Swiss-Prot record, chain B:
Assembly, per entry: Binds to host ACE2. RBD also interacts with the N-linked glycan on 'Asn-90' of ACE2. Cleavage of S generates a polybasic C-terminal sequence on S1 that binds to host Neuropilin-1 (NRP1) and Neuropilin-2 (NRP2) receptors. Interacts with host integrin alpha-5/beta-1 (ITGA5:ITGB1) and with ACE2 in complex with integrin alpha-5/beta-1 (ITGA5:ITGB1). May interact via cytoplasmic c-terminus with M protein. May interact (via N-terminus) with host bilirubin and biliverdin, thereby preventing antibody binding to the SARS-CoV-2 spike NTD via an allosteric mechanism.
Function: Attaches the virion to the cell membrane by interacting with host receptor, initiating the infection. The major receptor is host ACE2. When S2/S2' has been cleaved, binding to the receptor triggers direct fusion at the cell membrane. When S2/S2' has not been cleaved, binding to the receptor results in internalization of the virus by endocytosis using host TFRC and GRM2 and leading to fusion of the virion membrane with the host endosomal membrane. Alternatively, may use NRP1/NRP2 and integrin as entry receptors.
Result after altering residue 29 to A: In strain: Omicron/BA.2, Omicron/BA.2.12.1, Omicron/BA.4, Omicron/BA.5, Omicron/BQ.1.1, Omicron/XBB.1.5, Omicron/EG.5.1
Taxonomic lineage of the native organism: Viruses, Riboviria, Orthornavirae, Pisuviricota, Pisoniviricetes
Protein name: Spike protein S1
Length: 40, 50
């Protein structure tokens, strides 16, 4: 089996304001994304 | 919780069907300030705390 740990990304997290879970966002395959942040 | 050390819950990212609590017979009192309890189902807030 395999194990994954987010503790190598951050040591801790507090005061969480938002959470969302869905399906994965991600010859060879080319993946393109656009990230915008408008009006919150 | 005890009154000197009251607890808080944060409510977000949900649909607040306030009519469920307003029309409940399990309460002895229900009073609102700054808002009417019969209009709550038509309102949106940035945060709700209980
Ligand atoms: C959590 O974050 C919100 C938004 O920045 C802030 O208003 C609130 O005071 C923070 N809570 C704590 C305990 O820091």
């Amino acid at each position: 089996s395999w194990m994954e740990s987010e503790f190598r990304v951050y040591s801790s997290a507090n005061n969480c304001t938002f959470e969302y879970v869905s399906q994965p966002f991600l010859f060879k395959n080319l993946r393109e994304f656009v990230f915008k942040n408008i009006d919150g | 919780a005890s009154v000197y050390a009251w607890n808080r819950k944060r409510i977000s990212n949900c649909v607040a069907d306030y009519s469920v609590l307003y029309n409940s017979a399990s309460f002895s009192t229900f009073k609102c300030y700054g808002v009417s309890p019969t209009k709550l189902n038509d309102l949106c807030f940035t945060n709700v705390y209980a």
